[PDB]
Design a protein around this ligand. Structure first.
Ligand SMILES: CCCC(=O)SCCNC(=O)CCNC(=O)[C@H](O)C(C)(C)COP(=O)(O)OP(=O)(O)OC[C@@H]1O[C@@H](n2cnc3c(N)ncnc32)[C@@H](O)[C@H]1OP(=O)(O)O
Ligand SMILES: NC(=O)C1=CN([C@@H]2O[C@@H](COP(=O)(O)OP(=O)(O)OC[C@H]3O[C@@H](n4cnc5c(N)ncnc54)[C@H](OP(=O)(O)O)[C@@H]3O)[C@@H](O)[C@H]2O)C=CC1
Ligand SMILES: NC(=O)c1ccc[n+]([C@@H]2O[C@@H](COP(=O)([O-])OP(=O)(O)OC[C@@H]3O[C@@H](n4cnc5c(N)ncnc54)[C@@H](OP(=O)(O)O)[C@H]3O)[C@H](O)[C@@H]2O)c1
Ligand SMILES: NC(=O)c1ccc[n+]([C@@H]2O[C@@H](COP(=O)([O-])OP(=O)(O)OC[C@H]3O[C@@H](n4cnc5c(N)ncnc54)[C@H](OP(=O)(O)O)[C@@H]3O)[C@H](O)[C@@H]2O)c1
Ligand SMILES: NC(=O)c1ccc[n+]([C@@H]2O[C@H](COP(=O)([O-])OP(=O)(O)OC[C@H]3O[C@@H](n4cnc5c(N)ncnc54)[C@@H](OP(=O)(O)O)[C@@H]3O)[C@@H](O)[C@H]2O)c1
Ligand SMILES: CCn1cnc2c(N)ncnc21
Lengths: 448, 445, 446, 447
């Protein structure tokens, strides 16, 4: 385990270590981390994406601690989660992350710390601050934290009216090194948020990435600007993003039309409170009739199915992310004047759509990407208030991150797949038991 | 003759509203018409070989009955645009089909269901009579027209009438259009005539001007602000020419795209300086029928950066569609907007969504303009910030030739038509403002 | 009576459109009216002592001529609104000035310029006739009506009809209002009657619910989002009874202000938890007639923070005006919004602009709702997501006392008025949906 | 000082490379205009107008501060004296040392600013000499001006618009090492590129008033101006109003300029405006007494505006005078229009008739200063030659006290600049063609 690392974990588990105790703990010289290796980035060349196996490319390595810099924190990570970006990274698609690290390392000697022949992955965490760098006053050793994954330098003026517009804006653990699928992580302190006290470590680590994105994409004025009464088509409603978009639609007074591909996922949507659920596999939609042409009759068939649930109304908003396969239909079925908001292209990023439906019906396609610190704060605030709930289905140990990534790669999962890092077992970290007890049924709605 | 006395009063310049209210209406007026019986005369031909001179008739027609909230206008000039051309060759379908269907609705809509169709979706002229409830307009008022008519019985359009589900283009999906000596319009289509322009100039900006205004200037489109860089496709064409003028008048920089040196010269006459000739540059955005070439998106992006000092455009003014749309999405600045109101080259758009979401761009659909936007666009013409783009004017009897000229893209700017006006150059009552702007007013001649 | 035959047709429940078209129109109808010769009758009185019972008359009036784009409606029920009170005490100015100005536009608007004013800005009922150009509505249609009157001849209103320069409020700046057996409206005022509600229930939301929707929910007002904290003045009155519902159903947190424990109980019945009784707290925002007390602003702000865990509200839902408006601006969060549609306590607002500009706040003026917003607000009632808030119902002949109730702030929720309806409880045609929501529907009942 | 002279020689030569600046030895002191902590009570009992900045401002040699992460050391060629600088120099509303001391408790880095002297100045134009750790976008030799807003952004509040940050500092006012000195220390996210067609002192002039007017009038966080709009602009030849007038014209809108003298009206015409109201000549009396306004005077203003607009009411009112004018501002605004306010010069207790606000769906939008993106865009429009500086008079660094007195007593119609390292006026232009095109408007406020 390592003596210094074990002493850090014992401090956390004791429950009554003070900030000065964490400050006095000796730092280990290495930590265990899930990594990619630069020499292997071509190992899947010529394969179909589905045949690329994250278990072959993900390694469990001992890596040295990076040097702590200004505005940063070293964090002892109790738990993290698998995200799709973890899957993209592990199959080197659409491009290898080592290209991101190389470009990032050119900015300054500080960013050059990230340009290494291994890539520590992971874009969520829940844990405890161990150290803070120069200029940090809002966070201190011992603070229980979750982290959002926005990395912004904010030297350029572009990001000072919404930090997502920073030209050097990046995603921590994907376009930067020292991610959260490890025993320790390095983050900017303007990634830190207070851990929800009613959640376990693994529950608390599970919402950060997808919940923040869903909030900006659906709730905020920088995305679709949902209002009560809206009809919202939610693709992938029982996956990572969808498990929060569906909660936002319902808690916001809108009507979600949830799309899933199994009756088990349909049951979860009903457990969340949704009533209008479409099983795209039962319906057998074939939006593309061959490699280059779509089928407008299948767009219309989806549109008619939506109208069955809404009493003849077309959706005000489409919550997109599947990309090429569904995007033509998404644009077609949207109400006149409505919005398709997209943050991803899982099935393929070369989108095709019929612009007659977009311009003649005054629709818009809004590109959305993660969330600024304020939006991340607001999304985590709603979790802390028990208004939005974690969606954990299954938890793996850190050593099993390859199988966890394979689960998501092959769409075998529901909700979020969590990963224990330093936490020795599930169930630890709750310090608000009465709030937990109030919401326990919903907290566990995605569990196997 | 009653029509001649109307024309004499207009030409005198000093007739009063009561004088117009006292003039006796003619029993018929001269109009450019389609005939119901001929709607198949072009069957089998390619579109380019359909000759509007064969289908367009110069007839004497009776006056429609004036309804509530309508105006009878004495028309001094009008215009020929692509809509007029398509109707004149019965494309995509005969206009009589909609006139008949909608004419089943009520005795009011049935007025338009006739065996002839008076075409024309622009006018500049003088109000003669107004229907019941009209408050804003009276005989003698000098007017141009916004061609979009809405009934607004649905709530959908009451926060922006472009969301109304039942729009009609006057002179296309209605009868009694502007290519005639008289016309019938709703009073909430009327706009004040710019005083520094001639009749035919005032009738010219019309729908492409208000469409460009909504798409580029208004908050329902791109919401231009001074300092913005704007890529403007087809910058000497209809939409692009007004877009270029709006960019300059708003304190922004147009990056104008055209396909010939003559068109570049016209952009300079409008006041632009950053001009890209897409054919001289040889852009091949598509490699074959199914795959684009991102190296060519980037080559365009690098050329844009030559004019802007390294900056990428805040706004792309789109309308070519499939050929250009992938490049438009690529070159747009992080957080920027691609606004689109047409897809000339093809409506099946393909683009790389990684650039759109990773750089938080948006594609905003826009269509025509609501009446407030049409008013603001015409008001910027009236202020002398935006100028008409006439190349050539025909007499009413020659409307067939005017339509063929548009059909075969014979002029760089717009084609006007004199209706009652006996010659070009009449109707200016602000000679001081006109003198200031004469060179730009004539930039397309 | 031709009127009795119309009512019997409605009460039968199975008359067809053709039957309504064949019914003879009566030559007069009963109407609550003001009289032009009386607009000075309250000279020298304090507003409180002006009595709506003295100024409101029950008259037989002739039917107006039906014009293009209009509908003659048989009115089963209506409601009292505060503009009914304002009208009846001729404050801040006489409505006859509005009618005189309106009548100058055209011979059609001149129909409204009469020596009597038929009041009422809500209705639920049945269409009898439609004018020229009307295809979306026909006789026999069961309707409620919003009170926006827009002519839409000017370009100004074609990107949001509230900006029409000739925009008016039906029954307040126009004649032939809904507190009568018949009413004349534009057909673009008509919305489908919620089928699970009685006539009086269906007449009660229209005006205040539409306004609260534009003011709080829509992008033309405050643009509420879930997680917001919202200060709601008058939370158990007409506007507040809908604003509180929109806050809760939209996922936000209302801080409800009321002035009695009885009203606090209603707020809790609606689902609110953070309730401030301004009478129990004894706020005195004004030291005297010209100066406010920033210590009292701060005391309100501190009380709000007790409910929100130290957070200041994102939105203030204003309408009390002078008395509260300085506090509303002070307590709002940095970057937040004060949205106002009224000034009940006085329209000369005073506030400290340092708090507005240095904290980048905004004051958004809001007025009624365009047709799309009114449609959306009625849609949420029809879907059973927003509920009527009727507390008491009066017969048409007692409209004077109904208005006095509101004038003196003795009511809660909405006070309804029966017009043609001979009693309460009629008009439900969706009993299954009604039973699902009946407990909430009755939350305001005495 | 030899090292300081070598730095100035490099700048004046015009062709020093970045590596040349990196190799220049730093001086161990620099000349600076300072306040002294022990003198903060020297004006007690006096009326503000009689407090003399020439008595409180010192010309001192001071040591260089330690350069921290994300900071730059700048060789200052020119600076400015604004109202903020004047207030500091007379210890109003309180002594600036109070904040420097409290904030200096936070950390060793904030404590660098807690000193017995305070180097003032919230504008600069100059050349980057050194950059601290992590800096990417700036290097030695870069020609810069500064945005004076300093934010640490540890709170999430300001990450959708940094003006919502709860803990801003105005550099040179709530920080030390200001611009009225030969050297200055700023955060690199205060730096902006110097407009090449302007002199050092001209480039330092637009500063905060220009970017505040930009946010208030042009940006979507303020009034969101569009071409064709009619804009009522109070105080149109003053600081805020002069830039607002230029933004209105540059954006294709019509400014209706309000001033109080014929000489001020001439300046508005020099800027390119035509619609000008002299509020003193018209004799507006919006307030009848201390407590009641005169709506007939609101209407008289409204009628005068209509004379210039062909009968239209303004889409936007650019407010900042406050109590005296704010009732009229709300009344005359068009239905659906916006009153934007960023100050209350005449009094912050605003009174207005809310019937006009809600019945015509108007709004009052508070704006304050500018975030760094808005400051970049405002300076960019100066660099494009759309917006011009408004300098009236320039003093040498040694005369900064008299410069501050001139501003304190409103001696000039435009701005007062200060030469720091620059040995004379007129240096630093590297785009003479663009300057020639705009020379007349550039000098509109001389002298
Ligand atoms: C749905 C439930 C609703 C509720 O329950 S909400 C609570 C109940 N409701 C209330 O409490 C409010 C009741 N209503 C009122 O209090 C009054 O109507 C008030 C105060 C709103 C306006 O009062 P006005 O004085 O009538 O308005 P104003 O504009 O002064 O009109 C006369 C015009 O002054 C001129 N003029 C205008 N602007 C300008 C300008 N910028 N420059 C120059 N001249 C200007 C002319 O245009 C002139 O026209 P003319 O030359 O005469 O043709
Ligand atoms: N918080 C901060 O850090 C700062 C705040 N400020 C504030 O913003 C300022 C305004 O900016 P600025 O433009 O640079 O100041 P200026 O002195 O340069 O311009 C103001 C000109 O407002 C006009 N004005 C003043 N008082 C009245 C009135 N009662 N009625 C109508 N017009 C009036 C005058 O113009 P005219 O007589 O010609 O009509 C005045 O010359 C302040 O007055 C100040 O309160 C300034 C600096 C820093
Ligand atoms: N829905 C309606 O009722 C209606 C009515 C009129 C028009 N429209 C539509 O909107 C029209 C555009 O309006 P418009 O008046 O501006 O037409 P226009 O005057 O003919 O100019 C538009 C052309 O766009 C450019 N262009 C065309 N094809 C291009 C391509 N493949 N790649 C790059 N640029 C291309 C420009 O040319 P260069 O770069 O070659 O110089 C310009 O000629 C569409 O053509 C379409 O007809 C619709
Ligand atoms: N512009 C529009 O479209 C529109 C639409 C509807 C109404 N309105 C207007 O808003 C009105 C209120 O309308 P409403 O229908 O809701 O009337 P309402 O039923 O009487 O409700 C108002 C509530 O405000 C509170 N209140 C009254 N005076 C107050 C004061 N001085 N300070 C604090 N709170 C006070 C009372 O609540 P508590 O005593 O319990 O605190 C009362 O329940 C205005 O006067 C007006 O007519 C405007
Ligand atoms: N830009 C950002 O900030 C951001 C943030 C998070 C995620 N993302 C991206 O967004 C994508 C989804 O992320 P996630 O965490 O939600 O992953 P996820 O847990 O796997 O959920 C995706 C869901 O999409 C559906 N789906 C998958 N392929 C589909 C297809 N071809 N057609 C229709 N539906 C399909 C759902 O399944 P069923 O219909 O089968 O039930 C699946 O549960 C990923 O590409 C990820 O990289 C982007
Ligand atoms: C052709 C009719 N039609 C138009 N839009 C749709 C739709 N979304 N869904 C189904 N049918 C439709």
């Amino acid at each position: 385990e390592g003596r210094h690392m074990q002493e850090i974990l014992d401090a956390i588990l004791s429950g009554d270590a003070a900030s000065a105790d964490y400050a006095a703990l000796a730092l280990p010289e290495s930590y265990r981390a899930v990594t990619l290796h630069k020499g292997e980035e071509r190992m899947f060349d010529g394969l179909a994406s589905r045949d690329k196996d994250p278990r072959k490319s993900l390694h469990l390595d001992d890596v040295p601690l990076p040097e702590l810099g200004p505005g940063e924190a070293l964090v002892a990570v109790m738990a993290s989660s698998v995200n799709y970006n973890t899957v993209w990274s592990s199959i080197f698609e659409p491009v290898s992350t080592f290209g991101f690290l190389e470009r990032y390392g050119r900015l300054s000697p500080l960013t050059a710390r990230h340009d290494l022949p291994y890539h520590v992955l992971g874009s969520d965490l829940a844990g405890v601050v161990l150290r803070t760098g120069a200029g940090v006053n809002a966070w201190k050793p011992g603070d229980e934290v979750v982290a959002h994954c926005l990395s912004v330098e904010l030297e350029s003026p572009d990001g000072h009216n919404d930090t997502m517009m920073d030209p050097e804006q990046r995603i921590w653990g994907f376009e930067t090194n020292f991610g959260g699928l490890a025993q320790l992580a390095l983050v900017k302190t303007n990634q830190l948020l207070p851990k929800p006290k009613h959640l376990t470590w693994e529950e608390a680590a599970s919402p950060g990435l997808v919940n923040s994105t869903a909030y900006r994409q659906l709730v905020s004025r920088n995305g679709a600007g949902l209002k009560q009464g809206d009809n919202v088509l939610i693709w992938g409603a029982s996956g990572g993003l969808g498990s929060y978009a569906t909660q936002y639609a319902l808690a916001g007074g809108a009507t979600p039309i949830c799309v899933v591909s199994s009756p088990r996922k349909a049951d979860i949507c009903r457990a969340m409170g949704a009533e209008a659920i479409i099983d795209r596999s039962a319906e057998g939609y074939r939006f593309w009739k061959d490699e280059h042409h779509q089928d407008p009759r299948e767009w219309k068939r989806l549109g008619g199915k939506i109208r069955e649930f809404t009493g003849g109304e077309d959706v005000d908003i489409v919550f997109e992310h599947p990309g090429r396969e569904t995007f033509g239909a998404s644009v077609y079925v949207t109400r006149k004047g409505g919005t398709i908001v997209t943050c991803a292209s899982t099935s393929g990023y070369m989108h095709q759509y019929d612009n007659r439906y977009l311009w003649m019906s005054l629709k818009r396609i809004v590109g959305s990407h993660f969330a600024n610190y304020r939006e991340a704060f607001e999304a985590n605030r709603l979790v802390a208030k028990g208004k939005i709930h974690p969606t954990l289905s299954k938890v793996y140990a850190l050593e099993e991150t390859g199988q966890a990534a394979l689960d998501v790669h092959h769409n075998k999962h529901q909700g979020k797949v969590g990963v224990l890092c330093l936490a020795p077992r599930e169930g630890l970290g709750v310090t608000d038991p009465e709030l937990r007890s109030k919401h326990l049924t919903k907290i566990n709605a995605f569990r196997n």
